[PDB]
Amino acid sequence: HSDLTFCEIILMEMESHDAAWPFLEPVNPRLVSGYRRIIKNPMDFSTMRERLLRGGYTSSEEFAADALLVFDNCQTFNEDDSEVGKAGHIMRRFFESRWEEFY
Ligand SMILES: Cc1cc2c(cc1S(=O)(=O)NCc1ccc(F)cc1)n(C)c(=O)n2C
Numbered sequence: 001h002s003d004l005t006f007c008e009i010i011l012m013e014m015e016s017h018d019a020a021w022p023f024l025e026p027v028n029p030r031l032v033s034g035y036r037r038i039i040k041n042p043m044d045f046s047t048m049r050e051r052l053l054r055g056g057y058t059s060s061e062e063f064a065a066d067a068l069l070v071f072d073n074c075q076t077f078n079e080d081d082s083e084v085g086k087a088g089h090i091m092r093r094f095f096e097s098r099w100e101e102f103y
Pocket of ligand 1: 021022023027028031032073074077078084
């Protein structure tokens with residue numbers, strides 16, 4: 001039980017982070033040219049939240065795979081010095097940081 005509890009804590013702290021604005025909702029491919037073609041498996045914090053409330057995470061590690069997917073997609077699509085990229089680096093470092101001081 002404590003596994004998914006810590007997932008709730010981490011996901012809530014990510015949802016409310018100052019750098020979280022790019023990842024709160026699915027990327028709108030109609031508005032981001034090329035995103036559909038470049039990113040095979042989109043992921044975002046609201047999709048993770050919907051899946052977590054609905055109970056659809058078996059382990060803490062599937063959760064961590066979805067978070068890492070958020071940041072891998074970010075680095076794949078955005079230059080490291082773009083605004084979304086800078087936000088994504090702050091969020092990724094925050095996630096690995098929080099994740100490790102649990103497990
Ligand atoms: C919020 C956001 C998150 C992103 C993103 C772009 C944006 S956004 O700020 O540009 N929103 C789309 C948009 C809005 C108005 C426009 F006129 C044009 C585009 N990318 C390229 C990503 O990988 N993530 C996660």
